[PDB]
Amino acid sequence: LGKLQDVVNQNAQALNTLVKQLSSNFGAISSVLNDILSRLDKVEAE
Amino acid sequence: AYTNSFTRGVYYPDKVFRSSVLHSTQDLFLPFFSNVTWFHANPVLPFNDGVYFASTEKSNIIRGWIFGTTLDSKTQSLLIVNNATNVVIKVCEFQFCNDPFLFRVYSSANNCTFEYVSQPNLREFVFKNIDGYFKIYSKHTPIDLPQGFSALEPLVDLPIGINITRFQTLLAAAAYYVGYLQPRTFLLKYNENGTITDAVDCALDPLSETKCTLKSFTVEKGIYQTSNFRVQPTESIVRFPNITNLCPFGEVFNATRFASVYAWNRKRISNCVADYSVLYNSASFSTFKCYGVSPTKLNDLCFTNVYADSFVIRGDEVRQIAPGQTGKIADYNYKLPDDFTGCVIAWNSNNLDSKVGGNYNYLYRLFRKSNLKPFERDISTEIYQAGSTPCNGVEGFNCYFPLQSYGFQPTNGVGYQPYRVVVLSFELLHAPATVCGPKKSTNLVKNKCVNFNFNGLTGTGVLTESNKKFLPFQQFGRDIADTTDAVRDPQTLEILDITPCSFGGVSVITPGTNTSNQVAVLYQDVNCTTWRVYSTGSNVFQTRAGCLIGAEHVNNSYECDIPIGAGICASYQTQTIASQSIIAYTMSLGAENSVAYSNNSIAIPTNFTISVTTEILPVSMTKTSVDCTMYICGDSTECSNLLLQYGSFCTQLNRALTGIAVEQDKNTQEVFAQVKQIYKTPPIKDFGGFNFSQILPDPSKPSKRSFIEDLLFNKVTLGFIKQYGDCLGDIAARDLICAQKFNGLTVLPPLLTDEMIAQYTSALLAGTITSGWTFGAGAALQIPFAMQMAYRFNGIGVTQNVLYENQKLIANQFNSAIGKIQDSLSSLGKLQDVVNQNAQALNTLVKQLSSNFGAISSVLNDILSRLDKVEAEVQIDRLITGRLQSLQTYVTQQLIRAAEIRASANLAATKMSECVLGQSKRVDFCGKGYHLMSFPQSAPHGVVFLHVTYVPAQEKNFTTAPAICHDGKAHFPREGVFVSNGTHWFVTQRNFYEPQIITTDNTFVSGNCDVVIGIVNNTV
Amino acid sequence: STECSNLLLQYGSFCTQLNRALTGIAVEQDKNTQEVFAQVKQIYKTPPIKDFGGFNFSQILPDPSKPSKRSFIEDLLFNKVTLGFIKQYGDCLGDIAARDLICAQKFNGLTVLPPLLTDEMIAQYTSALLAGTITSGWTFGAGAALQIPFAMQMAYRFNGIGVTQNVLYENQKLIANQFNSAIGKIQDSLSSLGKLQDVVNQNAQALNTLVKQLSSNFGAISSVLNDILSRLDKVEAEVQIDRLITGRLQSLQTYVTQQLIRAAEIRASANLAATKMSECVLGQSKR
Amino acid sequence: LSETKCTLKSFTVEKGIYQTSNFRVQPTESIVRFPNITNLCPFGEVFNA
Ligand SMILES: CCCCC/C=C\C/C=C\CCCCCCCC(=O)O
Ligand SMILES: *[C@@H]1O[C@H](CO)[C@@H](O)[C@H](O)[C@H]1NC(C)=O
Ligand SMILES: *[C@@H]1O[C@H](CO)[C@@H](O)[C@H](O)[C@H]1NC(C)=O
Ligand SMILES: *[C@@H]1O[C@H](CO)[C@@H](O)[C@H](O)[C@H]1NC(C)=O
Ligand SMILES: *[C@@H]1O[C@H](CO)[C@@H](O)[C@H](O)[C@H]1NC(C)=O
Ligand SMILES: *[C@@H]1O[C@H](CO)[C@@H](O)[C@H](O)[C@H]1NC(C)=O
Ligand SMILES: *[C@@H]1O[C@H](CO)[C@@H](O)[C@H](O)[C@H]1NC(C)=O
Ligand SMILES: *[C@@H]1O[C@H](CO)[C@@H](O)[C@H](O)[C@H]1NC(C)=O
Ligand SMILES: *[C@@H]1O[C@H](CO)[C@@H](O)[C@H](O)[C@H]1NC(C)=O
Ligand SMILES: *[C@@H]1O[C@H](CO)[C@@H](O)[C@H](O)[C@H]1NC(C)=O
Ligand SMILES: *[C@@H]1O[C@H](CO)[C@@H](O)[C@H](O)[C@H]1NC(C)=O
Ligand SMILES: *[C@@H]1O[C@H](CO)[C@@H](O)[C@H](O)[C@H]1NC(C)=O
Ligand SMILES: *[C@@H]1O[C@H](CO)[C@@H](O)[C@H](O)[C@H]1NC(C)=O
């Protein structure tokens, strides 16, 4: 039943990588909006 | 005297070596096929953007040139003259003559700076004047202007720094030419040595744009899409409100006494003209910064809500007048919004505000409970509580007077001297304005594409009367796309409509550059029944897909050659009375033939033919892998470290690529490894007189392939071991294969080799020739080939004695049919297209590494050789983002292709199972006709099916009846039909004429002979 | 904008790719139509004398008294779907462009190409198929068309499903009446195709969202190139124009990817239709 | 094997074949090649006239 199990595994893997990809910086100074907004004013945070 | 330059005037745009490449550049080039002016045996001509000067000479008559604006002693001029002994270059204030010649050129040389002297058959020169540099390119070539192509080389770049608008030649028989240069795009070609030997002028013709797009000098037969029809603007328009007065610069920047910072002032500015040049001789400003606009754009704008605030502060507090500052002034006195749009101006005023012994008339606030809001004022005078101890007016040790005083003395340090500050705020391009700049209006032009500037808003388009009613407080009008569509004229107050002046698609039909150089153009949004075209012609054909211009209409109908659209195709005549041309016609649907129907007539075949047809199906595509770090960062440790902030984006790509790679092997497996028993070819070749030698394995080759397989494997042009030293050095500069894998792009081999695939195919053939379809359902059982063919004939509705009586005819027909296929295979596009696509996808990925993506360069080493860590972290990230997007696009397209290839592979597997391991009843699934058998052959990345079918031929006409009434009962054939030749009645079969006597054995009676329609009589 | 045109050259290899994909799709569509309809290259004329055992085909055969040669049911079908046109520059110049919604698309570079086969040609193919199958049976799909009376063909077809032919020759009249009534019921029902309408709806929506997405800022100070260039000099305006270029290129890429994904499904449906034609119309099916 | 473990972000690996990074080689030394010039630029003339 590997043919059926593969679909479930693929869906779970996709949804888990989506969550894991929230810790990237993408070139910013931090990956946490709260940290960014606790230290910089509006113009520098935009 | 006009003349045509053809391809003269091409120079090297850079100083960098290139070879075996095609390069697209943009610079000031002399347009291809442009008319130059001819001078024989000395006027003053304009110098517009550069000049291409050429001289056919034999005795050194042309000596030099002079450049300038006016050639008298009121301006500076450049002299480049070649006297008999020297070449002298001077940039002075010359006084020249009407007719200078050699040496009497000028009279006085008053003052000047630049000087270079000493420097102890067809000539071409190019001149330019950019950023204060005079550049020259030149070349000499030994043998009115000739054909050919030559590229000029850089000579000198003089820093003269003057203004040039006219030039003149110096003469001492000969002739010279003069052509101007314009900013165009050109596609150059470097040969093996790095010399330029060809070029293409994009946007000179309709076929020249296609060449630039494809990045090739050749084009194949077809129809291509070009850019939409473009229209350039004719003239310019400026429309400001008509105002006369000048803004109150004196009252603001020149007042006698200024306000205090805590009680700052504010006055409105309206109905004036902003011209700040009047301040250039009275006031100097130490600080001047603007925020939502550029300082160089203030002259061309209009402003909506202008205010001016003024106060006095000490010297070192000027840095606190900015949007995001903190401190004593920004907290309790004056604050700017974070979205500020305006300018801030400050200057020293120690002469007007400083009195000896201390000036105490300027105050500020030092204590306050909380911070101020933007543009808020607080002029209170309440005592301030700072210790929780109450105090109702009394003062001391806990309660203070909020306001403090400045002490301004004339001998203070510059940090403690008074400064006057003015802040201007306004809005741009949203509402009606009454303060404009120093610009002069022009007339209003309608119904033409022109440039405009309406209250500072610039653009292009066509103006038109409008039927909208703006409210008094509105000035502009937008749409869903958020662009300005209507505007109210600021003088007449009428409303206009702005429309883009570019519209309509264009296409070009070409027969092939290897054949001809003429084309036809289709204007898809024009009705010629003429105007929105690049060129009219003698013949102009109007279709329902557009207006075709350049083809000759004909009234015959042929099959489609180049589909144009809406039922019309085009083709090259060539072979005709006229030299050659293009023709346009309507495609034909296949020569309507006939129908001969009646209620008592039938046709029955009397013969047959054996036909063999070929079918091709793709089964696999190439497998690849990617090293993301090596593609994005190369060998840079800095980039490698910066890339970790995108860590989860490379495993994601590699997983999909690995999935595709492992799917390919399953695709091949399901198609070819159906029978896991390997049957060897029989040792004696005797199958009822049928010849299979051209499809059975041949052991007289390095492999065991058959003749047809060997023919197939040579019609598609292509694992391997490419060693590092194999393409070390220059060889990597042209390989095109290890150029890929120097960047991290590899190709993985297939799991099953072509030898194994051929072994599987041979097993299939041996099984199906020796056993029939039994080996596909279980244990293989032997059966003679003639009897197997009898079975297969019984499977299509024909008796077996028909085969046993025409065995030799059938065998001969089959042998000839098999020979014809290998005859035709002499000189597979469906299989070749897969290889072409897989190669192009990988080559574009390498090509896309030369983009900037908005940075200053596409070379990490160049970026890192000039900038430090912080300044390079901003430029590297743009390249990282762009190069990640490229790989993502490649992977998505690969997935979308793999899905289609899998669909094809599944179809091929079903076809094998149903046509090769059995006989099929589905119509048109295993060929055209009645399917008898089929044989598989292997091709590169695909399979080939040879289908044998039965086709009837040579029909004859017969009369027929539905039933026969013998003696009051109704008789039915029970198999086949009743036919009559005119006097006698017989019963035969549907697919072959074979009459018999009507009797009870081949008949059944289930009627009374009263109701059947069409019953005859005769007898049985 | 010439400035934007010059700044866009640093993404030159991203437009040819999109155009290549779109051209592939557009070429595939004509092949889809051909494989389904142009199966037979011999056009058969409608019989001059209409005598088929009492069967009435008048509602599905070509009608020669219409501006085209479409049949009654075909016209009913064509009236139920609400969509090769020439739209001229002078046609929608002015305020009309603010509501047309068709030349608002093509003021921004988005155009639609006509199909290669017209509706009249497709109907001619269908008429040829009908005439062939009614006058020859299934022999014309295998070779030369051999004529046969319709009643005898129908007896063949009854034998094809295990019923003797006398069962047809003794109930011909009732069978013809039933067939005529059943045919009438279909045109009765076709009075007042959601599978076919969705294709048009999806394509139009995809084209309209592309035009709508041109008001996004993408992080810049404004979504208007003229507004950006009327206030900032080159150095300050390059920074803003780059963000707009990035966002709009991304929009185009998303549109193209969705178009490819839809083309795959349309191709699967077309392959099913071609196989169904071959097996159900040119023969008799046992599946 | 360690590179595979790091890529899979797991301390165990299942039976199979896995792709690792391309073959890498590090540089052995450093090189500098500027033109041979002796004179010193004229700072006095420009900044001290
Ligand atoms: C010696 C004490 C060190 C201070 C503790 C560290 C950080 C405190 C927060 C900010 C630094 C104080 C800066 C004061 C100078 C600016 C004063 C002003 O013009 O507003
Ligand atoms: C130009 O020459 C005149 C001589 O008449 C001289 O007075 C003037 O100073 C010169 N200008 C410069 C910039 O040297
Ligand atoms: C250009 O290079 C080829 C080999 O690459 C060489 O044979 C030829 O001589 C070169 N051309 C010149 C002008 O030297
Ligand atoms: C400012 O005032 C001084 C003295 O009153 C005067 O000389 C100067 O011209 C004035 N400047 C302007 C721009 O009015
Ligand atoms: C406005 O007044 C209220 C009530 O006195 C006060 O609480 C608030 O702080 C004031 N706003 C500012 C910006 O000081
Ligand atoms: C072009 O205009 C003419 C004039 O009205 C019209 O008859 C013709 O149909 C138009 N062309 C098309 C393709 O409709
Ligand atoms: C049937 O066709 C074959 C090949 O064309 C021919 O040799 C043979 O004579 C034909 N049979 C008759 C009865 O004509
Ligand atoms: C089969 O064909 C091959 C090639 O045409 C030929 O050499 C061979 O002799 C043929 N078979 C027989 C039995 O002749
Ligand atoms: C059968 O008769 C019809 C009607 O005359 C004719 O068109 C057809 O050609 C005939 N068949 C053959 C094989 O000649
Ligand atoms: C065919 O129709 C004609 C016309 O009425 C008729 O005379 C003839 O008997 C019919 N033949 C059959 C077999 O029904
Ligand atoms: C068949 O024969 C009967 C007499 O047995 C005759 O009455 C009848 O008319 C014949 N059929 C036709 C159509 O004439
Ligand atoms: C066939 O249908 C048409 C239209 O409904 C009708 O006019 C005709 O009468 C029908 N056939 C017969 C034989 O009545
Ligand atoms: C510049 O000239 C002064 C005056 O002689 C001298 O003291 C100084 O050293 C000179 N500059 C340098 C860099 O030596």
Author numbering:
A (entry chain C): 945 to 990
B (entry chain A): 27 to 67, 81 to 141, 157 to 174, 188 to 210, 215 to 243, 262 to 618, 632 to 678, 687 to 828, ...
C (entry chain B): 746 to 828, 832 to 940, 945 to 1039
D (entry chain C): 296 to 344
Any passages from the paper?
The S trimer glycoprotein is responsible for binding to the ACE2 receptor and for viral cell entry after cleavage at the S1/S2 junction and S2´ sites. Receptor binding destabilizes S, allowing S2´ cleavage, leading to shedding of S1 while S2 reorganizes to mediate fusion of viral and cellular membranes, enabling entry of SARS-CoV-2 into the host cells. The BriSΔ variant, originally identified as a viral subpopulation from SARS-CoV-2 isolate hCoV-19/England/02/2020, comprises in the spike an eight amino-acid deletion encompassing a furin recognition motif and S1/S2 cleavage site.
In our analysis, all BriSΔ particles exhibited the locked conformation of the S trimer we had described previously. In the BriSΔ C1 structure, we identified virtually identical tube-shaped densities in all three RBD domains, indicating high occupancy of all three pockets. This loop is now shorter due to the deletion and thus more rigid, as evidenced by density in the C1 map which allowed to build a poly-alanine chain. The cryo-EM structure of BriSΔ evidenced exclusively particles in the locked conformation in which RBM binding to ACE2 is obstructed.
